[PDB]
């Protein structure tokens, strides 16, 4: 019944409309502290984040799950500052993404389990802020290290009850390998979200995972590089599929009877240093609504297509609550 | 004046200086996210204070911590241990072998601005300014490594702060690094070609010293007679004899000596710090306790050894 946020423990009824895969800043370990001028200043980034979260709140958002791990440069102090200023609950993450430094990548599965447990049970750094989710990743076939991370995440989830969420290359069907590794450790599918799943039109892959009890992360809805095909960097990140196509997968999974397995988000950020220089400016031009894209543009889109309000409320409120609750 | 973690110091205050050392070899943000890996931050700090105090009692007055952003440099820890041990510590900027995505995707102009920020403004929100730029290559330089060496040269040219390198001495890296630094217009007197004691080729070292380069004979205690691939198969005496060999060639003023020691090591296998502590119990005190008396026994005078340990580092670190 209680989940950990950057402001402390809250009850699941307080969570409300929740965006399950978001970021305040997409960076690297220690980067924001060492070079805040990359984002203008730390103050400029904080103010931009507060404006965006306040706009999201006005649109209906009550909670966002910041899936930024240590290697994505998660700065919990920044998350706490912006959460309080915008009055939007933010759930922090532990885990490891695809840029682990030497001190992380040379560790055993036992050592990684203890790190994840430290961030969930004790706290992140010296802040006392506890992680409420574990973020892991693969991009195609898992490397020997990525396999250890998935196993460590599963062991950390089994000891705490906190969920696991993933980054995938949906086109390569990564969810199947991830799922197999999680189950080999005894982890329940109901504790896992196979993210970036809206990057494929293969409904057979999505429904099969949904049938096993997995939560499906249709989390990059505003990602579209239509209009900017001359920009190779933006095209590789955002893709050539429209927001409408990504959004119709929510309808397709409801129509197949898997409304309870759907998690929706924007995968948005206010700062982005782990990619090419002016990517944040390009992204803000594509989607000016930012994190508010789901309640403002996606929810009314699905309403006119025939999806009931109680099903949409069930996806945005009930599903994240069941997912985030420690069991 | 040379910038330290406790503020500016004059050239005369530097004294006996170890030019390539580390308080902790880690990764960006690692020490603050998982201090329990080292026992605790308090335990690491206490071990560092004892090791620096031991080096101080052996004659050392200043150490240059060449730990970069990606080696997990924590300047606030460096400042704490420096105060407690009464040893000056010069912090570093630059990039090593483990840059994260936010660093490795940057242009030469952006990396120059980062290095400049750490030298001119300060490191993080501490106000502590770097007094040396650390860079690295393993064999033939990768496209990104070339960008870093160029950004390092440009940061040095705008500030007067020196550049120190990590090399794969067996693959003759110093020659390529030298060509890149020179193409940028950087004076050889502002560059130290480090890890140069890992080779038996004297002709390579003398040729670089003739061009005006400072030779970093900095891994003297490294001997393994995963632990064998890091320390090497050669003895400390063989590495120490290279100092004498370069003095005999008339390049006394071009030599910089150090230990390349640390008190915490997380960027390698789990129990490597314990393995390293058995091999060399002297730690950072290895140079004044074992290397200097060894050289005095081989016929090297005191004024020459004082020239290598006091005069050369002071001239190298002094912003020119
Ligand atoms: Co992702
Ligand atoms: Co994301
Ligand atoms: Co080195
Ligand atoms: Co070193």
Q: Which CATH number fits domain B1-320: 2.30.180.10, 3.90.1150.10, 3.20.20.140, 3.40.50.740?
A: 3.20.20.140
Going by C-alpha positions, the residue among A174, A298, A274, A296 that lies closest to residue A224 is: A298
Domain edges within chain B: 1-320
Helix (H) or strand (E) holding A262: strand A262-264
Q: How far is CA B239 from CA A240, B218, B242, B255, B287, in A?
A: 58, 9, 6, 13, 12
Tokens representing A242 are: 């429209």
Chain B residues inside the 8 Å CB shell of A125: 32-33
Q: Does A124 touch chain B (CB under 8 A)?
A: yes
d(CA A222, CA A293): 7
Distance CA A129, CA B250 (A): 60
DSSP B102-141: HHHT--HHHHHHHHHIIIII-BTTTTBPP-EEEEE-SSSP
Residue A77: list chain B partners with CB under 8 A.
none
Which bin fits B260, alpha (ψ -120 to 50), beta or left (φ > 0)?
Answer: left
3-state secondary structure of A49: helix
CA atoms within 13 A on the CB side of B263: 26
CA atoms within 13 Å, Cβ hemisphere of A172: 11
CA dihedral for A57, A59, A63, A69, sign (positive or negative): negative
Which of A28, A106, A111 is opposite residue B268, by nearest beta carbon? A106
Q: Considering CB atoms only, which of A30, A107, A111 is closest to B29?
A: A30
A281 touches chain B (CB under 8 A): no
CA A305 to chain centre: 26
CA distances from A20 to A113, A193, A220, A294 (A): 23, 9, 11, 11
Residue owning tokens 């579209």: A224
Our CA dihedral for B67, B72, B74, B75, rounded to 10 degrees, sits at: 30
Tokens found for residue A249: 């997968």
| Rounded Cα distance, A62 and B98, in Å | 38
Cβ–Cβ of B27/A118 closer than 8 Å? no
| Helix, strand, coil share of chain B (percent; to 5) | 50, 15, 35
Residues A99, B101: C-beta atoms closer than 8 Å = yes
Give the β-pairing of B2-4 and B7-9: antiparallel
CB B258 within 8 A of CB B287: yes
User: What single DSSP character describes residue B16?
Assistant: S
- Nearest-CA distance A57 → chain B (Å): 30
DSSP state of B35: G
| Ligand located closest to A269 CA | 2
* CA B295 remoteness from chain centre: 22
B22 marked as binding residue: yes
Whether B312 and B256 have beta carbons less than 8 Å apart is answered as yes
The tokens describing B35, both together, are 């201090």
Spatial distance between the Cα atoms of A190 and A187, rounded to a whole number of angstroms: 9
Q: Give CA–CA dist B127/B121, Å, rounded.
A: 7
CB pairs under 8 A between A and B: 93
Q: Is B103 in CB contact (< 8 Å) with chain A?
A: yes
Angstrom distance (rounded) from CA B65 to CA A243:
50
Residues 6+ apart with CB under 8 A from A309: A303
Burial label, A55 (beta-carbon count in 10 A; 0-12, 13-18, 19+): middle
Domain A1-327: what homologous superfamily?
Metal-dependent hydrolases (3.20.20.140)
Buried b (16+ CB within 10 A) or exposed e, B29-45: bbbbbbbebbeebeebb
How far, in Å, CA of B119 to CA of B155, rounded?
8
Residue B63 dihedral angles phi and psi, to the nearest 5°: -125, 145
Contact B117, A35 (CB under 8 A): yes
User: Is the minimum CB–CB distance between A239 and chain B shorter than 8 Å?
Assistant: no
B11: tokens are 């050239």
Token pair listed for B150: 């160029």
CA-angle at A224, arms to A223 and A229, nearest 5°: 140
CB contact under 8 A, B101 and A275: yes
What is the C-alpha end-to-end distance of chain A, expressed in Å? 9
| Angle at which helices A42-58 and A76-86 cross, to 10° | 40
State the maximum Cα–Cα separation within chain B, in Å, rounded to a whole number.
51
For ligand 3, the distance from its centroid to the CA atom of residue A265, given in whole angstroms, is 43
Structure tokens at A105: 């990548």
Cα–Cα separations (whole angstroms), residue A112 to A138, A232, B69, B89, B172 = 17, 36, 23, 33, 38
Q: Provide Rg for chain A, Cα atoms.
A: 18
**Residue B260 known to bind ligand:** yes
| Chain A hits for B101, Cβ within 8 Å | 28, 99, 273-275
B72 CB near a chain A CB, below 8 Å?
yes
Query: Which positions ≥6 away from A282 have C-beta within 8 Å?
Result: A228, A231, A234
CB A67 within 8 A of CB A165: yes
């Amino acid at each position: 019944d209680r989940i950990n946020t950057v402001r402390g423990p809250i009850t699941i009824s307080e969570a409300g409309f929740t965006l399950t895969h978001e970021h305040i800043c997409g960076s690297s370990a220690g980067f924001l502290r060492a070079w805040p001028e990359f984002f203008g200043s730390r103050k400029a980034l904080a103010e931009k984040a507060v404006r965006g979260l306040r706009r999201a709140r006005a649109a209906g958002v009550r909670t966002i799950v910041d899936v930024s791990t240590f290697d994505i440069g998660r700065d919990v102090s920044l998350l706490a500052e912006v959460s309080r200023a915008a009055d939007v609950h933010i759930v922090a993450a532990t885990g490891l993404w695809f840029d682990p430094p030497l001190s992380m990548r040379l560790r055993s599965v036992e050592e990684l389990t203890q790190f994840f447990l430290r961030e969930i049970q004790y706290g992140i750094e010296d802040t006392g802020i506890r992680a409420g989710i574990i973020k892991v990743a693969t991009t195609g076939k898992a490397t020997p290290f990525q396999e250890l991370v998935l196993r460590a995440a599963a062991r950390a989830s089994l000891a705490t009850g906190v969920p696991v969420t993933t980054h995938t290359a949906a086109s390569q069907r990564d969810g199947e390998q991830q799922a197999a590794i999680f189950e080999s450790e005894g982890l329940s599918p109901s504790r896992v979200c196979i993210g970036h799943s809206d990057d494929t039109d293969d409904l057979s892959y999505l429904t099969a995972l949904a049938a096993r009890g997995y939560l499906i992360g249709l989390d990059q809805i505003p990602f579209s590089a239509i209009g900017l095909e001359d920009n190779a960097s933006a095209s590789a990140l955002l893709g050539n599929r429209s927001w409408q196509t990504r959004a119709l997968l929510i309808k397709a999974l409801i129509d197949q009877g898997y409304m309870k397995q759907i998690l929706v988000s924007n995968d948005w950020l206010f700062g982005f240093s782990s990619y090419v220089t002016n990517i944040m400016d390009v992204m803000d031009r594509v989607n000016p609504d930012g994190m508010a894209f789901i309640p403002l543009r996606v929810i009314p889109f699905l309403r006119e297509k025939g999806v009931p309000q109680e099903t949409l409320a069930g996806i945005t409120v009930t599903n994240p609550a069941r997912f985030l609750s420690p069991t």
